[PDB]
Amino acid sequence: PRTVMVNLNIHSSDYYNRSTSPWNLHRNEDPERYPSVIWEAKCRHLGCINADGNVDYHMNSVPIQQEILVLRREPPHSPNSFRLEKILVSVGCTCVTP
Amino acid sequence: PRTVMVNLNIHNDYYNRSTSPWNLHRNEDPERYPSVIWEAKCRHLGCINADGNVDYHMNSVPIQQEILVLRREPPHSPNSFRLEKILVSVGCTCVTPIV
Numbered sequence A: 001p002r003t004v005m006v007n008l009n010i011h012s013s014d015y016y017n018r019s020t021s022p023w024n025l026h027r028n029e030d031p032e033r034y035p036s037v038i039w040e041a042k043c044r045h046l047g048c049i050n051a052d053g054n055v056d057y058h059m060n061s062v063p064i065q066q067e068i069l070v071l072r073r074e075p076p077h078s079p080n081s082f083r084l085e086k087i088l089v090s091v092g093c094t095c096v097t098p
Numbered sequence B: 001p002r003t004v005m006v007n008l009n010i011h012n013d014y015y016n017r018s019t020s021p022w023n024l025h026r027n028e029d030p031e032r033y034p035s036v037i038w039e040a041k042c043r044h045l046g047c048i049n050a051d052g053n054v055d056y057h058m059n060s061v062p063i064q065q066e067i068l069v070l071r072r073e074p075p076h077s078p079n080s081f082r083l084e085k086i087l088v089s090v091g092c093t094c095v096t097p098i099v
């Protein structure tokens, strides 16, 4: 264990609507985790929006997955003690050539 | 102060075909945890078309997200931190510019 003290008191999105692989945000909630709420990107379409403004299936919208560190309550249900943990979160969508 | 204890011992390529591909840039700060953060930098100003050529009628833009980091408090402290928000680039997407 490398135990440290953390003080939790801390001292654009509408532009991504113009993406050829647009996404919406999905609420992910876990009361055993900090941050408990994580907004996860879900691609709106299987294809990408082409020059005509239409969904084109010759290209694919794919979620960008990132490794994210979160705090897991340790022991479970502990309000003040945690262990660092890695999870995968979707942070947006990009358009790929299959 | 909302002081909590954190155990820092972690429990636990595809996007190359993107029309708005990106590379990773090393962001290092010895006063922060994680000290090293890899940020996405868009490879091109435009988006890659069907022919494999850059088209400047569209733009590759970095997706900026707010993430939480630990700042050493007091400075240089090996075991005490304050939570802090920073803005990082987590990938690139292709956008149709405003006309």
Ligand SMILES: CC(F)(F)c1nnc(N[C@H](c2cn3ncc([C@@H](C4CC4)N4C[C@@H](C(F)(F)F)NC4=O)cc3n2)C2CCC(F)(F)CC2)o1
Binding pocket: A034, A035, A037, A038, A039, A066, A067, A068, A069, A070, A071, A089, B006, B033, B034, B036, B037, B038, B039, B040, B066, B067, B068, B069, B070, B083, B088, B089, B090
């Ligand atoms: C909104 C949220 F997703 F819940 C969220 N916000 N911050 C976190 N987690 C915070 C957080 C910060 N980072 N910074 C870097 C990384 C690494 C991944 C290889 C491990 N990445 C991911 C990628 C990107 F950051 F650019 F995305 N590039 C990287 O180098 C993960 C990460 N996790 C977390 C909150 C608890 C804490 F303070 F104790 C510690 C830090 O989650």
